[PDB]
């Protein structure tokens, strides 16, 4: 049995994922439709970092293969014997609200100008940062496959923990300097094929 | 040290610091904030201290090393009842009200400023002697000839204010007080420098020559004062 | 978990910050203020607040001047604002956010625009002709809420960390925040510095709320 | 080619080690999303009493790929596919009950 967890990532401040024309530091985008994109690798990595740091005694210093059983069963592993298949399955997230952004007569991304005033020179050496704008939304869905009936409650508690841990941190790029602040909303879980018995408890421990 | 001062201006004359929004009726407007309440911006005081310290040759350029550190802020914001209508008069000869009026700040208006500056090259040891130097040369380089030559008995309530205080810290801010208050180069001779700037000015307009050029005092609306405008008193106290 | 620093920065002098020379329409405005791009209202960048904040702490700890790059600042600043060494990179703990305006309605009650334009004249050499120019600031008295996030990674350092955050804010009321501030712009003042946490009430909130309420 | 973009692209990807907090960038060549791959699978039928259950299981396998990934770094975003235009045709000689297969494969 498999479950799908669907929500929205709304950008409270600007965001800037990725890099590598005649301009400095572009964002990583969709390659066909040129939409700004959250890579699912970046969302999975930041969620894994925050959830592994909170599901621990404070801080997190070891390799991702050496995490707790909840983290390793939620995000996968690669060992010579203790290899596990991940239960979460993240996806690349394209920009959903181009209609909402295009209503306000603003581009989906914009260029941020900022200096580095050297102290002994007091001269600007300016640089351009492309940022997808604030108020942008990103509809995601993560596929959760159910293997243990007695562990789906703890797995979903950890998933909600990772969500509201990411609500108090940023998502990629120059984050401490203004960028990256996100927030999660419209969080729900649905079943892929054939209804789970305990779906209401998951919608109420994930809808809070 | 970042020695901050609370300097305070009292207005010996009517003062009109630009504004940009400016139009026998000739209804004028003045610089205000977004609430419609007048104030004096700090760039005026920074220009006045540019007259004070940088009274030298034409090195007033982007390469300057003194006045990036002179941190002048704005002032407190005073209501519009501190404002009367006044007139423009040119005291060269036969002083008459010229048709160029302005709605300007009332004299003796108490306005205070949060002025600060670093100590890398800037102290009040420089400010005191530079202000006394600029004041003494404002008399002995341009206004002494206006005192001895083409002088009328109507102007002599008028305070000559030179025996008052030699450390009085007197500046000139740009308020339409003639085109002599917006100068930079008076060092160090009297009349060769005068004719120097006389051709420097008279290749910009069409006047027939006469000495001296243009002195603009003012008066009060019978009580009379003959109040020269453009100048103010400053005190220097910390915080 | 994490504890945030809610607050409100207000402007006691018309503040200038940011800039662009756009292709579409310059208009009768030279060097405009940085603004938020969707909500179209002005914005203090978190980058600008971090840069001026770090420069003022650099003026505070090693006093006077430094003439130093900001990857080799004092070690508390390397822990707080972040650093990138050769391979042994010492991470940040302090996350700023793009500060945008909150009190739109109380400026709209008085019919006051969010931003401010002034006609900054310039008198040149003794020819003495005005050179008019227009700069765009934001009106003094406008409020700006901020929520600085603070990851707790040392229990026995958050005392000194919040005391130097308050020392930096105390050094920032006596300064401008960016722009043409040296000739009468940019002066700020802090108010309503309330601290709340994400969940719980651990790593005691009372001492930090008192040392930011000082 | 109509949208003036290549058939495969390169995605740059980190792995920041929690000791040193430095990033080592890695180029992973990927195929652009929205690309389409027209497949055909040959089904040889040798028992009529099993073909309906076999196509039920085939459609279930396609549905299980709808909620999983096809190859490569799929847990990190990539690999997600979807099946479109699922139909059945006969090689030579028409199958009589082909409508139930083409309606439980096109559901």
SSE blueprint:
This is part of a larger assembly, with 3 copies of chain A and 1 copy of chain B (239 residues).
Chain A: E1 2-11, E2 37-38, H1 40-54, H2 69-75, E3 90-91, E4 93-94, H3 98-103, E5 109-114, E6 127-132, E7 137-145, H4 152-166, E8 177-178, E9 182-191, H5 200-206
Antiparallel strand pairs in A: 1-7, 1-9, 2-4, 5-6
Helix pairs in contact in A: 1-4
Chain B: E1 3-11, H1 42-52, E2 72-75, E3 83-86, E4 102-105, E5 111-117, H2 124-148, E6 171-172, H3 192-202, E7 231-235
> Helical region count of chain B?
3
| Approximate helicity band of chain A | 10-25%
Strands in their spatial order, largest beta sheet of chain A: 7-1-9
Helix content of chain B: 10-25%
Radius of gyration of chain A: 19 Å
β-strand amount of chain A: 15-25%
Shape of chain B: globular
Domains of chain A, number: 1
Gross morphology of chain A: globular
Quantity of strands of chain A, as a count: 9
N-to-C SSE string of chain B, H for helix and E for strand: EHEEEEHEHE
Strand order of the largest sheet of chain B: 2-5-1-7-6
Structural class, from secondary structure content of chain A? Answer: alpha+beta
Assembly category: part of a larger assembly
SS-derived structural category of chain B? alpha+beta
Largest interface: A-C, 31 and 38 residues
Provide an overview of this structure:
This is part of a larger assembly, with three copies of chain A and one copy of chain B (239 residues). With 208 residues, chain A is an alpha+beta fold. Chain A has one domain (1-208). Chain A has five helices and nine strands. Chain A has helices spanning 40-54, 69-75, 98-103, 152-166, 200-206; strands at residues 2-11, 37-38, 90-91, 93-94, 109-114, 127-132, 137-145, 177-178, 182-191. In chain A, helix 1 packs across helix 4. Chain B is of the alpha+beta class. Chain B is 20% helix and 15% strand. Chain B has helices at 42-52, 124-148, 192-202; strands at 3-11, 72-75, 83-86, 102-105, 111-117, 171-172, 231-235. Chain B has a five-stranded antiparallel sheet. Chain B has a two-stranded antiparallel sheet with strand order 3-4. The chains are: A alpha+beta (208), B alpha+beta (239). Strand 3 of chain A pairs parallel with strand 3 (76-77) of chain D, so a sheet runs across the interface. The PDB classes it as rna binding protein/rna.
């Amino acid at each position: 049995m498999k479950l799908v967890i669907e929500g929205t990532i709304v950008l409270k401040t600007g965001m800037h994922i990725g890099g590598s024309g005649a301009v400095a530091s572009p964002v990583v985008r969709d390659t066909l439709t040129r939409l700004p994109l959250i890579p699912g690798s970046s969302l999975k990595g930041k969620m894994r970092y925050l959830l592994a740091k909170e599901l621990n005694n404070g801080i997190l210093l070891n390799e991702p293969n050496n995490d707790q059983d909840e983290i390793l069963r939620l995000f996968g592993s690669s060992e010579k014997d203790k290899i596990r298949r991940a239960r979460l399955k993240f996806n690349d997230i394209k920009l959903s609200n181009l209609a909402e952004l295009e209503t306000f007569n603003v581009s989906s991304t914009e260029v941020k100008f900022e200096n580095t005033i050297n102290r002994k020179t007091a001269v600007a050496n300016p640089r351009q940062i492309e940022r997808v704008i604030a108020g942008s939304k990103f509809d995601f869905e993560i596929f959760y496959n159910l293997d243990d009936i007695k562990e789906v409650e703890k797995d979903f508690e950890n998933i909600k923990q990772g969500f509201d841990l990411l609500e108090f941190d940023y998502l990629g790029g120059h984050g401490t300097r203004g960028s990256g602040r996100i927030a999660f909303e419209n969080l729900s879980v649905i079943t892929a094929v054939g209804n789970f018995e305990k779906i209401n408890t998951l919608n109420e421990i994930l809808g809070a | 040290m970042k020695k901050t001062y609370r300097v305070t201006l009292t207005a010996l004359g009517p003062i009109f610091i630009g504004g940009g929004e400016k139009l026998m009726n000739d209804l004028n407007t003045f610089v205000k904030d977004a609430f419609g309440r007048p104030y004096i911006p700090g760039s005026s005081l920074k220009g006045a201290l540019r007259t004070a310290i940088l009274n030298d040759l034409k090195e007033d350029t982007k390469e300057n090393e003194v006045f990036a550190h002179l941190q002048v802020s704005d002032s407190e914001t005073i209501d519009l009842e501190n404002l009367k209508v006044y007139q423009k008069v040119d005291y060269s000869k036969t002083a008459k009200p010229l048709p160029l009026y302005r709605e300007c700040l009332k004299p003796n208006t108490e306005i205070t400023f949060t002025v600060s500056f670093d100590d890398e090259y800037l102290t009040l040891k420089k400010i005191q002697n530079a202000l006394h130097k600029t004041y003494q040369h404002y008399y002995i380089k341009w206004l002494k000839g206006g005192k001895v030559g083409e002088t009328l008995i109507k102007g002599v309530t008028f305070a000559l204010d030179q025996p008052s205080q030699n450390q009085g810290e007197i500046i000139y801010i740009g308020g339409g007080a003639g085109f002599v208050s917006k100068t930079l180069h008076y060092k160090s001779k009297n009349r060769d420098q005068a004719r120097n700037d006389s051709f420097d000015i008279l290749k910009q307009l069409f006047r027939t020559t006469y000495s001296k050029m243009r002195s603009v005092p003012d008066n009060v609306p019978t009580g009379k004062h003959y109040l020269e405008m453009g100048k103010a008193r400053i005190k220097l106290e910390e915080l």
